[PDB]
Amino acid sequence: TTIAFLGLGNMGAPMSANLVGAGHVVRGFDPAPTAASGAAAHGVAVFRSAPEAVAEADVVITMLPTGEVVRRCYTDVLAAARPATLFIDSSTISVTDAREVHALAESHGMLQLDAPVSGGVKGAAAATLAFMVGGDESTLRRARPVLEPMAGKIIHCGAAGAGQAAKVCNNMVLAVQQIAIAEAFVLAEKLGLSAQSLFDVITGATGNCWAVHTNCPVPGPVPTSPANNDFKPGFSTALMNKDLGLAMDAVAATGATAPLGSHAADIYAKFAADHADLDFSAVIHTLRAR
Amino acid sequence: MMTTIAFLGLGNMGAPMSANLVGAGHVVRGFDPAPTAASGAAAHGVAVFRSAPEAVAEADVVITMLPTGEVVRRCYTDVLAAARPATLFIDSSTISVTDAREVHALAESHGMLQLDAPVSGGVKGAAAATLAFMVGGDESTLRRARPVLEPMAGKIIHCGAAGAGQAAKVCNNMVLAVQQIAIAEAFVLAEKLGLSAQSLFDVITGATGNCWAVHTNCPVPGPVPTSPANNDFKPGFSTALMNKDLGLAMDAVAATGATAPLGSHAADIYAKFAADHADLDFSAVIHTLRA
Ligand SMILES: C[C@@H](CCC(=O)O)C(=O)O
Ligand SMILES: C[C@@H](CCC(=O)O)C(=O)O
């Protein structure tokens, strides 16, 4: 299989190197020369423009920063692709944007999936990413051997846009949970309940969740958690803030009532003005700001 | 070992609790101001008394299971001078941290050992003897108490000094309330986005967002056939009781000056929902997000 990989950033570059390593011919494009060079060093043939990269591809993967860039990339390459090329957008963009680009691609006789990922750069490099896929089951079947070498998990979430929707919904819950856990540790401390005691209880009770059992925002109970390493990401506040912005778009587009997710979004937006580079669990230290 | 236990408060939780102590071979002396409660407890082998002071007069251990801090405080004032010196008092009521510490000091000033040991698991846990006891107090007092707690308990966890049981419970349940609302918001958002409830369930449960409020308490019918959503939101854990816990959490926030934005927002949401839906499982809050 020949794959065109459009977007060779911090996620795209390690993903594309895993495809090289699984025996695919990978053609690439990125507007940053350093990204492009790095990718060429691990075997991607890099082209000066995206339509050139796409020209001989059986599969086109995009990993790009916004829906607007993804849409422009599609309109800039679709005429250059061969018929029934499989497009896979692994960017995290709105559900609306995803559905729009899916329909665009399919009106060209392409096959298209949304397949955004969780796991970050670390997962990208380790080939453990979780792909949450929207689109046709038979198209996912076709894509599977491409996704496998990048992936620890591949979940079909439903029709086009369901992958984006599933990720944004999970991440909105996660943000709420990370703040809630932080509130609980600070309350405990003021009540004279040790961090280890609270951790032992919550993890054995109804309140347990990854935000505590793995991302514990106080040092000690989980030695590997960011709190023990100066809140080095992990999962940055910048990225969490980005996902919550997409959750707020989805809430506005649907008229949904999401009082705690929206509150969480306000909290992280504000925290990202100061500490975008720290793991999102570091929110525990911004609660006195309100 | 077999012990004489006074059991003050024989309601929905105290009655099945006391029954299990009778089954384990303890002599249980009970009192409750509602004779209907006391009658049901008697039927299962509790010796019921005319007054709380009479029940405690010959007891090695005194357990309270009462509705509020005020009632616990009033009960201690009434009974502590009646009990034998160095009797072990265990309060398994859910009450404020401040109140717990006040009644603990009161008990000790009367010569009595005292633990806070609130429980989770509800009436079903109580009947099956699978309650979790979250204990505050001295380690040696808990050592003394273990053989009395075991026949009621699936888990006993020592949380720290007096008040720490109440503190650990109230912190967990505040978190639970926030998660239950947030899960509800994700499912209604999914619906509006055209993502199926089953698909969202599969995702979140396999991802970082997984928690009891979804895996066990899923607020949409279908994915978890045993959750309250499939049984007309019959409790389960009633809104009334979660509202009570959140009130205690807000008491703890107010007493410490803590900032708990989401916990306090969750308290506001549950206070409003409780006005009309006190009797529904607290997962039923999902109804407030659909127009
Ligand atoms: C195991 C995984 C794909 C292959 C891999 O480990 O890369 C999956 O089945 O989702
Ligand atoms: C609580 C005690 C056993 C009692 C029971 O399983 O009813 C234990 O597991 O610590």
Q: How far apart are CA A212 and CA B179, in angstroms?
A: 13
**Beta pairing class for A86-89 and A111-114:** parallel
Cα gap B87→B268, rounded to integer Å: 41
The count of CB pairs under 8 A between chains A and B is 235
Task: Determine the distance in angstroms separating the CA of B267 from the nearest CA of chain A, rounded to an integer.
Answer: 11
Q: Mutate which of B20, B130, B131, B156 to test ligand 2's pocket (most atoms within 8 Å of Cβ)?
A: B156
Q: Which residues from B are below 8 Å from A290, CB to CB?
A: 259, 261
Asked if the Cβ–Cβ distance from B193 to A118 is below 8 Å, we say no
Active site residues of A: 167
Q: Domain spans of chain A?
A: 1-159, 160-290
Contacts of A177 in chain B (CB under 8 A): 178-179, 182, 209, 211
Residue B53 corresponds to which amino acid? P
Q: How many A from CA of B19 to the centre of ligand 2?
A: 15
For residues B251 and B36, give the distance between their C-alpha atoms in angstroms, rounded to a whole number. Answer: 32
Ligand 1 touching residue A106 (CB < 6 A): no
Can you tell me which atom of ligand 2 is nearest the CA of B156?
Answer: 10
Q: What residues have CB less than 8 Å from A190, skipping those under 6 apart? A: B256, B257, B258
**Which residues sit opposite A87 in a β-bridge?**
A60, A112
Which residue lies with its CA nearest to atom 6 of ligand 2? B154
Residue type, A125: A
| SS3 assignment, position A11 | coil
Contacts 24+ apart (CB under 8 A), A99-104: A99/A160, A99/A161, A100/A67, A100/A71, A101/A67, A101/A70, A101/A71, A101/A74, A102/A134, A102/A135, A102/A160, A102/A161, A103/A160, A104/A71, A104/A74, A104/A75, A104/A78
Tell me A2's DSSP state.
E
Interface mutation target, options A169, A189, A290, chain B, most CBs of B under 10 Å: A169
Ligand 2 pocket check for B154: Cβ under 6 Å: yes
Q: Residue B161 burial by CB count (10 A; 0-12/13-18/19+): exposed, middle or buried?
A: middle
| Listed residue (B87, B86, B41) closest to B61, CA to CA | B87
What contacts A10, CB < 8 A, 6 or more positions away? Answer: A121, A124
Using CB atoms within 10 Å of the CB of residue B169, give its burial: 0 to 12 exposed, 13 to 18 middle, 19+ buried: buried
Instruction: Give the fold, CATH level 3, of A1-159.
Output: Rossmann fold (3.40.50)
| A160-290 classified as CATH 3.40.50.720 | no
CA A108 to chain centre: 27
| Residue of B156, B74, B175 whose CA lies nearest to B118 | B156
User: How far from each other are the two terminal CA atoms of chain A, in whole angstroms?
Assistant: 52
| Helix/strand/coil (H/E/C) assignment for every residue in chain B | CCCEEEEECCCCCHHHHHHHHHHCCCEEEEECCCHHHHHHHHHCCCEECCCHHHHHCCCCEEEECCCCHHHHHHHHHHHHHHCCCCCEEEECCCCCHHHHHHHHHHHHHCCCEEEECCEECHHHHHHHCCEEEEEECCHHHHHHHHHHHHHHEEEEEEEECCCHHHHHHHHHHHHHHHHHHHHHHHHHHHHHHCCCHHHHHHHHHHCCCCCHHHHCCCCCCCCCCCCHHHCCCCCCCEHHHHHHHHHHHHHHHHHHCCCCHHHHHHHHHHHHHHHHHCCCEHHHHHHHHCC
Which residues of chain B make contact with A95, given a CB cutoff of 8 A? 193
Q: Note whether B1-161 and B162-291 share their fold.
A: no
What are the tokens at B259? 């900032």
3-class state of residue A278 by DSSP: coil
Cβ contact A257–B206 (<8 Å): no
Torsion of CA A107, A112, A116, A121, to 10 degrees: -110
DSSP for residue A10: T
Rounded to the nearest whole angstrom, what is the distance from the C-alpha of residue A135 to the centroid of ligand 1? 19
CATH superfamily of B1-161: NAD(P)-binding Rossmann-like Domain (3.40.50.720)
Experiment type? X-ray
CATH of domain B162-291: 1.10.1040.10
Using alpha carbons, select from A237, A114, A235, A240 the residue that is nearest to residue A166: A114
Q: Cα A159 from chain centroid? A: 19
Residue for token pair 């970082």: B208
Distances (CA, A) of B40 to B13, B14, B23, B220, B276: 12, 11, 15, 36, 30
Q: How many CB atoms lie within 10 A of CB B123?
A: 15
Q: Which of B155, B169, B234, B272 is catalytic?
A: B169
Look at residues B15, B11, B85 and name the one whose alpha carbon lies nearest to residue B44: B15
Query: Strand A117-118 to strand A129-134: parallel, antiparallel, or no bridges (unpaired)?
Result: antiparallel
**What is the separation of C-alpha B46 from the centre of its chain, rounded to a whole number of angstroms?**
22
Residue B54 Cβ inside 6 Å of ligand 2? The answer reads no
C-alpha span between B218 and A158 (Å, rounded): 20
